[PDB]
Amino acid sequence: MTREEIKMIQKSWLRVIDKMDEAGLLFYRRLFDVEPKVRPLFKIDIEKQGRKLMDVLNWIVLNLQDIDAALDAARELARRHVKYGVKAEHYPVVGHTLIWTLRKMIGSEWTKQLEQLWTQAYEALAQVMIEEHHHHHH
Amino acid sequence: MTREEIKMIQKSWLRVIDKMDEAGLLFYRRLFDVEPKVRPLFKIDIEKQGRKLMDVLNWIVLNLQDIDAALDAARELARRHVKYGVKAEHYPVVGHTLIWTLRKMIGSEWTKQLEQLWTQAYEALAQVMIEEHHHHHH
Ligand code: HEM
Ligand code: HEM
């Protein structure tokens, strides 16, 4: 997840916080209208102090903030790559070669699911590093 | 990222480690055949001690292990949800309602990019929690 991405997530979260109570009511009312069967899981007076919307939003945001902080190490790695002469345009071919090599080495135990997981993991990490390359790239 | 997912990633990583040197050579040879222009970024004798494949694989795996450990808190949250009477089948509607509410509250500042980021973040967290529900679900 890139810095640009977490920034726009945080900004939209702040927008909801600004209208927190209104947003929370809207969430409950929509939830119970689309799926009345979950209504009994909540207090009869749940609108008065329940915070379902924020419970979910805050968990997401707090988790993403932890992941973003951890990715500072990847940004440090990218800065080293700048110094190695590596450019943002080089990341796709390394990724393709990574998957090509894994497919070869794992053989008949390689699966579409594995290919997807490794592809998504590489692509996400590469996107963080590419974002850093762009900042130093003169 | 679910426990099932990180397990299959780790298993495939162990398979590569078993043939680490062979895999590393294959990676370099493929890389330089598809993109000879990156060859000068590497030592003339890079096959002898370079570890590009493992450098990338290990970074991915070590990052994913940290995220998996952090997700123990989400599994704890899911266990509480089991006790609240929540079922795996309830997660989609909460997610749809989350996005519906954000779209409403954010209005003309809501974007397809924001919708995608929030959708993916919710879906991923929900998948971790659903996996836990399945274990307790009698
Ligand atoms: C997600 C992608 C990548 C990851 C996780 C990664 C990881 C690493 C790591 C851990 C090192 C060891 C040195 C250090 O920590 O600074 C390294 C070195 C290096 N990487 Fe990467 N790298 C990635 C992408 C690339 C790309 C796209 C290239 C382009 C050719 C590249 C070329 C190099 C070079 C030239 C070195 C130093 C020379 C060497 O180790 O032989 N890397 N990389
Ligand atoms: C990713 C999805 C979800 C997240 C992050 C989440 C988060 C939370 C949190 C932080 C709490 C406060 C209590 C605690 O920590 O145990 C809570 C309570 C609760 N949640 Fe969730 N939840 C999610 C999905 C759901 C779903 C799908 C339902 C189904 C209706 C649900 C119903 C409830 C109920 C009934 C409570 C306790 C009663 C209340 O707080 O009013 N949650 N949830």
Encoded tokens for A125? 């990490």
CATH number reported for the structural domain that contains residue A131 in this entry: 1.10.490.10
| Cα gap A77→A82, rounded to integer Å | 9
Range of the domain at A8: 1-138
Encoded tokens for B58? 């290990």
Q: For chain B, how many structural domains are there in total? A: 1
* Cα angle: B13, vertex B123, A133; to 5 degrees: 60
Give, as one character, the DSSP assignment of residue B74.
Answer: H
Give Cα B81 to chain centroid, integer Å: 23
End-to-end Cα separation, chain B, in angstroms: 24
Q: Is A93 close to B31, i.e. CB distance below 8 A?
A: yes
Pair B104, A26: CB distance under 8 Å: yes
Amino acid, res. B99: I
Task: Give the up-direction half-sphere exposure of residue A17: CA atoms within 13 A in the CB hemisphere.
Answer: 10
Q: Is B34 close to A60, i.e. CB distance below 8 A?
A: no
CA-closest candidate to residue A110, choices B55, B4, B13: B13
Amino acid, res. A21: D
- Long-range CB contact pairs, A62-65, < 8 A, 24+: A63/B70, A63/B74, A63/B125, A64/A1, A64/A6, A64/A9, A64/B121, A65/A6
| Cα gap B90→A55, rounded to integer Å | 16
Helix-helix angle A20-34:B91-106, to 10 degrees: 140
Determination technique for this PDB entry?
Answer: X-ray
Chain A partners of B5 at a C-beta cutoff of 8 Å? 117
Ligand 1: residue whose CA is nearest its atom 35: B41
Which residue among A12, A52, A59 sits closest to B125, beta carbon to beta carbon? Answer: A59
Per the listing, tokens 């997912």 go with B5
Pair B98, B118: CB distance under 8 Å: yes
Residue B88, ligand 2, Cβ within 6 A: no
CA-closest candidate to residue B30, choices B75, A44, B18, B22: B22
Pair B94, B118: CB distance under 8 Å: no
- Ligand (nearest to CA of A130): 1
| Cα gap A64→A29, rounded to integer Å | 27
